[PDB]
Model the fold of this input.
Amino acid sequence: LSVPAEVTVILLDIEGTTTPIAFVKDILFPYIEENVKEYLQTHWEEEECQQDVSLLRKQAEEDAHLDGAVPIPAASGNGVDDLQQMIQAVVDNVCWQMSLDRKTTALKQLQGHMWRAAFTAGRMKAEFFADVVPAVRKWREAGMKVYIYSSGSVEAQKLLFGHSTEGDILELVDGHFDTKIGHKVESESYRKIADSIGCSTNNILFLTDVTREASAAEEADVHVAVVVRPGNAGLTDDEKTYYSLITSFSELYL
Ligand SMILES: CCCCCC(=O)CP(=O)(O)O
Ligand SMILES: [Mg+2]
Ligand SMILES: [Mg+2]
Ligand SMILES: [Mg+2]
Done:
């Protein structure tokens, strides 16, 4: 509710915090499965697409031992028939990786390039709860710095903020962090985030919906608040009593 005087930075989780889970789980990711074949068919000749498929082929070779693994065999030729077969293999491999929650760099890389087309072309918009932007603006007016921490790549994060239901709000963010800085349930990740930002762990207030993230940040001597939004995983009675909860960014007083 009332931020400690020592806080100078607000670190924000995305899914379940600034953005509903429904958008991420039922819109953002399913979009990939629905568009990967069309995307590959249309942009196969692109140097970037060729590089993406190259990475996916390498990954497919490394997963060859896994049961149910989908191979991306060497093309049979360079005719349109051979290409159709190739494309199907890549599509099948991508969907397979997504069915299990395998978030490899090869997969994330292609997803990011596909999302760039979706958001830039205005086919999709990143959903933010109505209280987010106004609160963030006031926070910044009060001198607070604002950073984002999500498992989604920074490149993908920028697309979300650049094409939100609130328009382009990239300027409201001072920086982004993804799994490169470490995993969200590891306290060490938060100590590094403080280092990258250029502050102390105690100058940070992290807002997240998952308690496993909250407890990891607390262990890193970071201040935390648990955000409750529609569709979020329930909190235990003890967690509801232990953590400071907020149902809106407006509930935070500086
Ligand atoms: C661009 C990808 C989706 C990002 C939504 C996420 O926040 C997931 P996570 O809960 O791993 O931080
Ligand atoms: Mg979350
Ligand atoms: Mg440090
Ligand atoms: Mg202290």
Observations:
- Strands lie at 9-12, 145-149, 175-177, 204-208, 223-227, 245-246.
- The first strand starts at residue 9 and ends at 12.
